[PDB]
Amino acid sequence: KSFIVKGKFKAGSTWEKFTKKIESQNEKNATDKTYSIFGSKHGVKRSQVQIESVAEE
Amino acid sequence: TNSHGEKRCTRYKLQKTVRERGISPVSRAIQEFEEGQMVHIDIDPSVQKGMPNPKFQGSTGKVIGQRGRSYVLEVRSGNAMKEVFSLPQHLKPQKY
Amino acid sequence: MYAVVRLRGQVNVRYTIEDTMKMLRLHKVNHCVFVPENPHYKGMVQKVKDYVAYGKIDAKTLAEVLENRGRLEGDTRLTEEYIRENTDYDSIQAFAEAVIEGKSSLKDIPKLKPVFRLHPPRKGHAGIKRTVQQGGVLGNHDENINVLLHKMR
Amino acid sequence: KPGSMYRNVRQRSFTRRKYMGGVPGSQVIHYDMGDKANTSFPVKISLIVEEKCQIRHTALEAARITANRHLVADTGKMGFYMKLRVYPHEVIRENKSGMRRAFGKNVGTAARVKPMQKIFTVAVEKQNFKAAKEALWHAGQKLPTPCRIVVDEGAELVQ
RNA sequence: AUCAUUCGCGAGGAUGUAGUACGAAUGUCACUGCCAGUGUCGUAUCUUACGUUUUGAAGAACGGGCCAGGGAGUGUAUCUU
RNA sequence: UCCGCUGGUUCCUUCCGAAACAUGUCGCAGCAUGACCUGACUUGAGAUCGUCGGUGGAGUAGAGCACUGAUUGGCGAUUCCGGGGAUCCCUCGCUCGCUUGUCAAACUCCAAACCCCCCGUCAUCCUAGAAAGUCGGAGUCCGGACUGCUGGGGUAAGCUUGUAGUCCGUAAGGGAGACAACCCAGCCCGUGGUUAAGGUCCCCAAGUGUCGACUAAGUGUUAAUACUAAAGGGCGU
RNA sequence: UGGGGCCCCGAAAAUUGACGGGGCUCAAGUCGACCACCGAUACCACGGAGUACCGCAAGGUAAUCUCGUAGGAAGGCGUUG
RNA sequence: CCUGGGGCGGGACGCCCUUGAAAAGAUAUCAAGGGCGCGCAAUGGUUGACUCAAGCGGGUCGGAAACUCGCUGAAGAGUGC
RNA sequence: GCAGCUUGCUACCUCGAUGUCGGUUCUUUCCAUCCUGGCCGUGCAGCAGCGGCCAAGGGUGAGGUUGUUCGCCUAUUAAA
């Protein structure tokens, strides 16, 4: 149940790439967890997180 | 203090673009308009005569008569109808 | 066919937006109108986007709204007998399908009111301080306007 | 006279010196420091303010002095190039009775800078990057705005 | 409501049961000898008097201790409608 | 006596419902005229609060240095006008250009979004009377606030003075602890239901709700509001 | 090394006091999302009152009628003769 | 009389232009820049003929201080204030 | 940056009055601490200083001039 979520998110003034590794139930669950994790870690809304892809690892 | 002359706040209202300063095209001065025709008021600063108030610059008037060279126009200003006299040098026909 | 339902009241609204509301006949909250897809109505809805929810309505939702909430002059409820006596269509569902397809008109119903005074949304709506794109209810719902219309019946 | 007085931008520009009278001259003397002729410095960092503020000429002079001293001490007299990009164009005035006819008299000059606007640019070689960065941090400590250093050229030369 | 199926990571949702049982009320049939009202007190929610000056009055702004009675756009001339 | 100044001016319901603004005034605590409110009548077919497209006005934002002025070095020349110690024996600041770096209410080679006039269109109102006109009665010219305009001035002010919208004034009821003007909402009476704003540990109706993280400081448990502390630093996490 | 979230230091005021209070620490705080419910006189439904306009009347229409200070207009109640 | 109380100061107390003024119009302050209370029978009207400022080169103690020639020159002049 | 204890700015409250400075008497509070208690540094040998941190329980007096607040001066005092 491991996923790799690649994308980029806005960290203040600069966009930042990410390739996070996530443990979740399915791909959409991993996307939701990615949004939640980036909202928690950076206070950014889901409009400020751009998930390029989610792939089973 | 601030004055109440006719030329109040006309610095850019009565300006010409850079490449139209000088003698204007003379075709605009001998154009005839019919009764009831709608014409814009775009004042030519170089024609220092026949010029309506700059407050009516950018307004569309209706030709209601002629007083020699000049045309009489019915022009809406807020909620009133004004009779504005203008030489054709400052006038321009509306295109439909 | 735009469905436009008013969700915010008239206090503290600009006179221009409120006059657009009056021209759309949306004088009160939970009042809904159906207008064509022309650029005139598109611009009016874009003008009033901050006080209504709008979208594309489907024939089933139009039929349910007409049956449960359509009214006649004197405050009479639409019925299938009136529909069959005053239109060429057998039922309200067929009439609504025709209206959605564009081959009929609500003005083809004699004495029918152009305003549908809908119920408040059961279980609430998304909120009138945020747009659809922000998680609220204001603005363009696209084809999900039918969900709100179903829960406001 | 604290810099917090003429710090926030609340007003239009005041720069046309032909319609005012008697502006005190700026305290900042030079605007190019270090080795002015050479341009082949590989690394080139700059200090950008992150708020919209007005920086007085005295603050500009203090930052310039501190950065120039640090650079001359570390890199040498011609081991660096320093450019102060902004000129104090805004005229700072003061109301010196009370509030009747309160339009102030000209008391100084300030540069009206925008967010992410470059204030100082320092060009140095590869081995002097940390010294330039430290000096520019010291310079930013004298300014009335939060600041950040950014690398303009030589990013791959540093890391 | 309850239950069946299904969806959702989950809190829960959807479909059916069910627009059913119920439901403001409108009628009708029994039963009953009170009810309405009034005084006071209690529980729940709400409300900082009144008139005035004021942008703003519960004001630490002005007025009244209380009660009874008295207490303020009238006539002539002229003009207009 | 008079006062433009202070106080008072007595029954009910119903319909509509402002202005705290401009110019003149020995005018500035007043008044007149107009805007705005109200009533009636005449007239008789259009009107424009909104949309879309088009013909026109742009000179604000932003941008820029092409004009007017500022402004930073480098480089090249003015065998010119000029600072320094008899062949003006040679040192050279300004001035004029090519490059760098900056600017402007009272600069503009450019140039929006709003907005304005007019035309068409849809939309709404309109013979149960559009636009227009005439007449009767006024109140009003102490305003204030919120949200924008970096509005102007000011170190700032719950300061002062503008502008667009909306409010209080004159606005109930519901909610923010209370809150003139902040959110829902404009409100005839009674009953039932469902919602808005906001809330759901108790006070207090409804979650000791779900998922994923952060915080160890009782930090916090504070939409807006003038009722919420900064620069700087932290091998805290 | 750069860019970020939260927190800490920086951080001193006068009667005893303010997240509204109690209190609260994988929260009853913050951030990103979601679910259900509560909750107005808003909205819907029924009944009723008044109002506007129309109608000879009977009556019809009102989503587009129902807050209101200064103030205008209409109809009523009361006192004495 | 105005007046960030009044007074002192000043006149924003009549007229004209730029900005303020937020690209229609309007828009305040003891807001910013200011100006005007005149001059001119020519410094006016019309016609004809010409083209200005400033640079570059040529020309004699006519000096880089005159006048004149040639080139450039949409105006960098002049048009009373 | 903090405080609001100086002086300004403003005109929101009070002009059908909130009795105006200073002193005296009595009570209370703050800490940015003068002394008293505990600490750290020192260019701290000791004595005694200088600088800083915690700490508001107690103390912080008597006199000459001046209405003074403030300030000057005197002799005590752990400090006044």
PDB file of C-alpha atoms in Angstrom, chain B:
ATOM      1  CA  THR B   1      -6.966  78.614  -5.174  1.00  0.00           C
ATOM      2  CA  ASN B   2      -8.686  76.847  -8.061  1.00  0.00           C
ATOM      3  CA  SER B   3     -10.324  78.891 -10.805  1.00  0.00           C
ATOM      4  CA  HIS B   4     -13.579  78.446 -12.717  1.00  0.00           C
ATOM      5  CA  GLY B   5     -12.455  79.176 -16.263  1.00  0.00           C
ATOM      6  CA  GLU B   6     -13.658  77.331 -19.333  1.00  0.00           C
ATOM      7  CA  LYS B   7     -10.200  75.775 -19.783  1.00  0.00           C
ATOM      8  CA  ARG B   8     -10.231  74.205 -16.308  1.00  0.00           C
ATOM      9  CA  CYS B   9      -8.408  70.857 -16.239  1.00  0.00           C
ATOM     10  CA  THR B  10      -7.867  70.757 -19.999  1.00  0.00           C
ATOM     11  CA  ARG B  11      -4.152  69.880 -20.092  1.00  0.00           C
ATOM     12  CA  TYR B  12      -4.720  66.453 -21.659  1.00  0.00           C
ATOM     13  CA  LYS B  13      -8.295  67.103 -22.808  1.00  0.00           C
ATOM     14  CA  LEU B  14      -6.967  69.732 -25.247  1.00  0.00           C
ATOM     15  CA  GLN B  15      -3.793  67.867 -26.169  1.00  0.00           C
ATOM     16  CA  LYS B  16      -2.909  66.446 -29.568  1.00  0.00           C
ATOM     17  CA  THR B  17      -1.085  63.178 -30.070  1.00  0.00           C
ATOM     18  CA  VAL B  18       2.589  63.582 -30.938  1.00  0.00           C
ATOM     19  CA  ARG B  19       2.243  62.861 -34.669  1.00  0.00           C
ATOM     20  CA  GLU B  20      -0.949  64.842 -35.260  1.00  0.00           C
ATOM     21  CA  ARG B  21       0.167  68.243 -33.961  1.00  0.00           C
ATOM     22  CA  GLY B  22       0.035  71.006 -36.542  1.00  0.00           C
ATOM     23  CA  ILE B  23      -2.455  71.647 -39.308  1.00  0.00           C
ATOM     24  CA  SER B  24      -5.163  68.998 -39.088  1.00  0.00           C
ATOM     25  CA  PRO B  25      -6.518  67.197 -42.162  1.00  0.00           C
ATOM     26  CA  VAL B  26      -8.733  69.750 -43.894  1.00  0.00           C
ATOM     27  CA  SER B  27     -11.249  67.146 -45.086  1.00  0.00           C
ATOM     28  CA  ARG B  28     -12.833  67.103 -41.622  1.00  0.00           C
ATOM     29  CA  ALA B  29     -13.733  70.808 -41.905  1.00  0.00           C
ATOM     30  CA  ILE B  30     -15.958  70.581 -45.001  1.00  0.00           C
ATOM     31  CA  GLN B  31     -18.042  67.525 -44.114  1.00  0.00           C
ATOM     32  CA  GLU B  32     -21.814  68.026 -44.084  1.00  0.00           C
ATOM     33  CA  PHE B  33     -24.199  66.296 -41.674  1.00  0.00           C
ATOM     34  CA  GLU B  34     -27.929  65.696 -42.016  1.00  0.00           C
ATOM     35  CA  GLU B  35     -30.738  66.499 -39.605  1.00  0.00           C
ATOM     36  CA  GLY B  36     -31.010  63.871 -36.880  1.00  0.00           C
ATOM     37  CA  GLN B  37     -27.585  62.368 -37.581  1.00  0.00           C
ATOM     38  CA  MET B  38     -25.529  61.293 -34.566  1.00  0.00           C
ATOM     39  CA  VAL B  39     -22.033  62.795 -34.390  1.00  0.00           C
ATOM     40  CA  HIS B  40     -19.278  62.470 -31.809  1.00  0.00           C
ATOM     41  CA  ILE B  41     -17.668  65.529 -30.232  1.00  0.00           C
ATOM     42  CA  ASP B  42     -13.875  65.108 -30.432  1.00  0.00           C
ATOM     43  CA  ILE B  43     -12.442  68.597 -29.993  1.00  0.00           C
ATOM     44  CA  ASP B  44      -9.473  69.546 -32.171  1.00  0.00           C
ATOM     45  CA  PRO B  45      -7.164  71.716 -30.018  1.00  0.00           C
ATOM     46  CA  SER B  46      -5.594  73.357 -33.077  1.00  0.00           C
ATOM     47  CA  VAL B  47      -8.983  74.725 -34.186  1.00  0.00           C
ATOM     48  CA  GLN B  48      -9.255  77.415 -31.519  1.00  0.00           C
ATOM     49  CA  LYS B  49     -12.692  78.516 -32.776  1.00  0.00           C
ATOM     50  CA  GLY B  50     -16.072  76.809 -32.729  1.00  0.00           C
ATOM     51  CA  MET B  51     -14.947  74.518 -29.911  1.00  0.00           C
ATOM     52  CA  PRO B  52     -17.639  73.347 -27.450  1.00  0.00           C
ATOM     53  CA  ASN B  53     -16.904  73.036 -23.739  1.00  0.00           C
ATOM     54  CA  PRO B  54     -14.382  70.245 -23.047  1.00  0.00           C
ATOM     55  CA  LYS B  55     -16.996  68.781 -20.673  1.00  0.00           C
ATOM     56  CA  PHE B  56     -18.786  67.470 -23.781  1.00  0.00           C
ATOM     57  CA  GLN B  57     -15.641  65.911 -25.242  1.00  0.00           C
ATOM     58  CA  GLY B  58     -16.340  62.237 -25.859  1.00  0.00           C
ATOM     59  CA  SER B  59     -20.124  62.712 -26.021  1.00  0.00           C
ATOM     60  CA  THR B  60     -22.402  61.854 -28.934  1.00  0.00           C
ATOM     61  CA  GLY B  61     -24.745  64.656 -29.963  1.00  0.00           C
ATOM     62  CA  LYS B  62     -27.685  64.668 -32.362  1.00  0.00           C
ATOM     63  CA  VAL B  63     -27.648  67.237 -35.164  1.00  0.00           C
ATOM     64  CA  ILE B  64     -30.765  69.397 -34.820  1.00  0.00           C
ATOM     65  CA  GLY B  65     -29.888  72.283 -37.126  1.00  0.00           C
ATOM     66  CA  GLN B  66     -27.199  74.491 -38.573  1.00  0.00           C
ATOM     67  CA  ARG B  67     -26.161  78.046 -37.703  1.00  0.00           C
ATOM     68  CA  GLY B  68     -23.880  78.873 -40.606  1.00  0.00           C
ATOM     69  CA  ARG B  69     -20.665  76.875 -40.639  1.00  0.00           C
ATOM     70  CA  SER B  70     -21.473  75.373 -37.250  1.00  0.00           C
ATOM     71  CA  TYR B  71     -23.906  72.603 -36.358  1.00  0.00           C
ATOM     72  CA  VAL B  72     -26.348  72.592 -33.452  1.00  0.00           C
ATOM     73  CA  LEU B  73     -26.299  69.348 -31.471  1.00  0.00           C
ATOM     74  CA  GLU B  74     -28.554  67.909 -28.791  1.00  0.00           C
ATOM     75  CA  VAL B  75     -26.168  66.403 -26.240  1.00  0.00           C
ATOM     76  CA  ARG B  76     -26.926  64.502 -23.037  1.00  0.00           C
ATOM     77  CA  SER B  77     -25.032  65.786 -19.980  1.00  0.00           C
ATOM     78  CA  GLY B  78     -26.028  63.813 -16.893  1.00  0.00           C
ATOM     79  CA  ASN B  79     -29.779  64.248 -17.213  1.00  0.00           C
ATOM     80  CA  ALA B  80     -30.130  67.497 -19.202  1.00  0.00           C
ATOM     81  CA  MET B  81     -30.268  68.099 -22.941  1.00  0.00           C
ATOM     82  CA  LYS B  82     -27.855  70.785 -24.131  1.00  0.00           C
ATOM     83  CA  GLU B  83     -27.716  72.669 -27.415  1.00  0.00           C
ATOM     84  CA  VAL B  84     -24.018  72.625 -28.325  1.00  0.00           C
ATOM     85  CA  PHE B  85     -22.664  74.618 -31.259  1.00  0.00           C
ATOM     86  CA  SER B  86     -19.706  73.073 -33.046  1.00  0.00           C
ATOM     87  CA  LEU B  87     -17.781  73.609 -36.236  1.00  0.00           C
ATOM     88  CA  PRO B  88     -17.365  70.357 -38.198  1.00  0.00           C
ATOM     89  CA  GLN B  89     -13.624  70.415 -37.432  1.00  0.00           C
ATOM     90  CA  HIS B  90     -14.501  69.171 -33.929  1.00  0.00           C
ATOM     91  CA  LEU B  91     -17.276  66.843 -35.142  1.00  0.00           C
ATOM     92  CA  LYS B  92     -17.223  63.307 -36.516  1.00  0.00           C
ATOM     93  CA  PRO B  93     -20.010  61.067 -37.841  1.00  0.00           C
ATOM     94  CA  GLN B  94     -21.045  57.958 -35.965  1.00  0.00           C
ATOM     95  CA  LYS B  95     -20.515  54.730 -37.902  1.00  0.00           C
ATOM     96  CA  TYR B  96     -23.170  52.023 -37.739  1.00  0.00           C
TER      97      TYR B  96
END
